Design a protein around this ligand. Structure first.
Ligand SMILES: Cc1cc2nc3c(=O)[nH]c(=O)nc-3n(C[C@H](O)[C@H](O)[C@H](O)COP(=O)(O)OP(=O)(O)OC[C@H]3O[C@@H](n4cnc5c(N)ncnc54)[C@H](O)[C@@H]3O)c2cc1C
Ligand SMILES: Cc1cc2nc3c(=O)[nH]c(=O)nc-3n(C[C@H](O)[C@H](O)[C@H](O)COP(=O)(O)OP(=O)(O)OC[C@H]3O[C@@H](n4cnc5c(N)ncnc54)[C@H](O)[C@@H]3O)c2cc1C
Ligand SMILES: CCCNC(=O)[C@H](O)[C@@H](O)C(=O)NCCC
Ligand SMILES: CCOC(=O)[C@H](C)C(C)=O
Ligand SMILES: [Ca+2]
Ligand SMILES: [Ca+2]
Ligand SMILES: [Ca+2]
Ligand SMILES: [Ca+2]
Ligand SMILES: [Ca+2]
Lengths: 431, 434
């Protein structure tokens, strides 16, 4: 039971928090706390100086579609932010001579070896959504796919979203099925993908401007204490009082900040699974695949791979930003290596970033759904990646869902797919 | 409305995909005779044997594309016949007269790509956003109203639509939703090869099986000359003989249907008259000169000859080539296997394997409206109509229309378990008016 013009705090300045604060700001007194020096979190664009001018390179969140991300798209559109097609072309390289396969054509020894399996996979995945809670790994095993397919094709292609470190093979089937079914990932063609003009940051910079002074950068919240009068927030050596609090931070962070003598919170937010990611923005051209170049996503496997004990060895994924259409005139290399197994030359490094991605096993999905129990109690609310469906659309729409619960309705009722997303995420979240 | 019973003497006129599938389903419950003018079953679905060093191959000269999502009934049918399928992605390369005046969906090379990239980009967005939100408008009209360049219309849109309308087609007059959905469903794209499948050993493989199942009932080289309903039934005149049937199913083009049909009713002329067609000449050849120098690797190769003249674009040429060597099962074949549709340039005759001449229906909003209207004459004088001109575009629509008729005559939809195949069936049934 929330009255208008309440004092509301939003903890976490990532996509979900920023969009939640921004929508909440219309009807309530809103304050947004953010630990780091910018808004976005995983949505980060780093300025790179080049012969064409200053480019803002997306190191984390970078992909969406008008179909997959309707709310994010309408938002970018309403902000006069242009988008552009950056197709998901993939090149996978293995230690043996010509042990490769790619999205664009049929070249490589690995392509020869696995072609029939790639072919059956697409069919099976397209036929699957029709006529559930099973891992991709389980599926591949029961449907007689080779171990070589699992580790030389499936695991590398899934690394683009999941990160090379991820136990991707343990992720729910529908997530993989739909990534194929909706041409996001393919073995035969580059996936239909878009990026935002001047980086993903552009939409967040606008939100920051709209919120102005309500945004508290470099203000990590240390504790959240509900009381009888209202919730108390401790941040930057000050105590702030609020009617309600919205957590837009990771479940592990939420729990660390959250201070209550209730152990339901420990049950619900305890041991959410995460995957660490190290994003390396660099100019070391040695990372490009000799046979690779032209492909956007370049996966490389180090020398001592060994198919038996495939799990111990890990791969490295590189984004070749030069391939991006707006970066076509740039003379200097712009590369992003995630979790580089081999050392990246330090003289060529621009910046490093360290994040953690949530795991997507059917158990993790079940864990996420269960939060509706604590939704709205002690004047607390939870949005973000850990409370919603995977991807940026899911993160920001969870923020939207909470704003609707606090009076500010879904801002795009006209956009039928955006309303469809909203309704879907609302059903998924306990709200 | 109508009463039909078991073991009726039923004739199916036209041995194309629609007719063959209709006869095949009908044969279960009725005495069925299938009349086919040509020496084989399939019509547009034709696979020609080519002898190569690696093996003897059946090359699809028409009707080579489908996929499991778009064509559920055709797919389940191929599957039930133990016919394998394989991914043949729709890679496209377009060539124009000027130096490096090209664009392709595999990469960003070419001067045409540089000139048109931003338009390709906006088009995909606009097309993806359209279905979710009028219906009766041509692609050309849409492109004009949404400020797309004339260069986009004739150097990009018209060539890419040439893939399955044919180079001669007034493709720009075709309905918007057909183009919107071709893009929306990754069948056609400017950024990636479309997701398409081909049938193992040619498209003919499924028809050869149907022909075997039908056996004797199939009367090849038996063009029907006239169809005469009477008070007792319907009389069919074919191959200098008169056959009597309880009901007749037309699985042929409306212009053919009308020519054969003879009644003292002018509703039939109103309904089947004015069906618009586009001629296609499919040339199976080995002349390697037809491949684009910059092109090769792309499956579909479009070439615009010298003296194009953008202002006089509407009356302009266009030649589309399929480079079959690019197909995965044809990878070890040493000899070239090319198909040029409507070649403007003189093709070397010593390199020609065979030619085929067909006519494709037009897809303007008016033509679509014309197709739906055929529900008026459906079931009258013991007559039934199925095929391309009575249904949605593509092979799935054609065969499914035959199935819809079969259900009307007792034989229900053979794949109720396959939810998408049943969904198609239901959709086509509503479209057809039965
Ligand atoms: C490398 C990488 C690539 C990705 N690529 C894509 C992609 O292409 N497409 C896509 O759809 N998704 C992608 N994602 C998914 C991504 O996780 C989400 O899209 C989105 O960023 C989630 O937003 P969020 O706010 O819920 O989490 P986050 O973006 O991580 O937001 C959490 C925020 O909380 C802040 N915070 C932490 N501690 C405190 C504290 N004590 N007090 C206050 N604030 C605090 C953090 O500083 C951060 O700003 C990617 C993620 C990563 C890591
Ligand atoms: C070059 C070409 C390429 C195509 N490619 C594709 C593709 O990739 N994918 C796709 O989905 N569709 C494709 N199509 C669409 C195609 O038209 C339909 O898929 C399919 O032909 C529908 O079959 P139909 O039986 O209704 O027509 P048709 O296949 O043309 O069948 C008509 C039949 O009637 C016969 N007939 C004619 N006169 C008589 C008579 N007097 N008596 C008896 N029988 C007669 C003809 O000989 C023929 O066999 C293509 C068509 C062409 C021409
Ligand atoms: C939304 C309609 C999608 N249908 C198609 O693209 C057709 O099946 C296409 O493959 C085709 O062959 N159309 C008829 C012209 C040959
Ligand atoms: C099916 C949704 O897939 C996604 O959006 C993934 C998880 C990304 C782009 O991180
Ligand atoms: Ca990643
Ligand atoms: Ca460079
Ligand atoms: Ca590329
Ligand atoms: Ca130039
Ligand atoms: Ca698409």
């Amino acid at each position: 039971v929330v009255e208008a013009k309440s004092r509301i705090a939003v903890v976490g300045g990532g996509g979900s928090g920023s969009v939640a604060a921004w929508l909440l700001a219309r009807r309530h007194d809103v304050t947004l706390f953010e630990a780091d020096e910018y808004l976005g979190g995983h949505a980060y664009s780093h300025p790179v100086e080049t012969d064409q001018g200053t480019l803002h390179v997306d190191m984390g969140v970078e992909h969406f579609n008008e179909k997959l991300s309707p709310n994010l798209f309408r938002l970018l559109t309403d902000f006069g932010i242009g988008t552009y097609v950056a197709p998901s072309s993939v090149h996978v390289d293995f230690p043996g001579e010509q042990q490769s396969w790619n999205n664009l054509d049929f070249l490589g020894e690995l392509r020869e070896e696995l072609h029939e399996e790639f072919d059956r996979f697409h069919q099976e995945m397209n036929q699957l959504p029709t006529s559930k809670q099973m891992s991709i790994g389980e599926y591949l095993d029961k449907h007689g796919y080779s171990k070589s397919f699992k580790y030389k094709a499936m695991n590398p292609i899934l690394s683009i979203y999941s990160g090379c470190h991820a136990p991707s093979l343990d992720y729910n089937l529908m997530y993989v099925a739909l990534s194929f079914s909706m041409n996001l990932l393919s073995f035969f063609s580059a996936g239909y993908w878009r990026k935002a003009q001047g980086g993903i940051h552009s939409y967040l910079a606008r939100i920051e401007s709209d919120l102005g002074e309500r945004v508290r950068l470099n203000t990590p919240v240390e504790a959240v204490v509900p009381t009888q009068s209202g919730v108390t927030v401790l941040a930057g050596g000050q105590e702030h009082h609020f009617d309600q609090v919205v957590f837009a931070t990771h479940a592990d962070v939420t729990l660390r900040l959250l201070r209550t003598s209730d152990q339901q919170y420990r049950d619900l937010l305890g041991d959410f699974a995460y995957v660490p990611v190290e994003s390396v923005l660099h100019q070391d051209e040695s990372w490009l695949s000799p046979a690779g170049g032209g492909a956007y996503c370049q996966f490389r496997m180090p020398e001592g791979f060994e198919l038996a004990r495939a799990e111990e060895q890990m791969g490295s994924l590189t984004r070749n930003c030069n391939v991006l259409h707006p970066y076509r005139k740039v003379s200097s290399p712009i590369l992003i290596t995630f979790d580089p197994q081999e050392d990246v030359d330090p003289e060529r490094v621009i910046v490093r970033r360290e994040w953690k991605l949530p795991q997507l096993r059917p158990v993790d999905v079940r864990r996420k759904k269960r939060l509706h129990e604590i939704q709205g109690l002690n004047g607390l609310w939870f949005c973000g990646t850990d409370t919603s469906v995977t991807g940026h659309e899911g993160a920001i729409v969870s923020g939207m869902v909470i704003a609707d619960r606090l009076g500010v309705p879904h801002p795009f009722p006209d956009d039928a797919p955006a309303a469809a997303q909203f309704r879907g995420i609302k059903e998924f979240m306990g709200v």
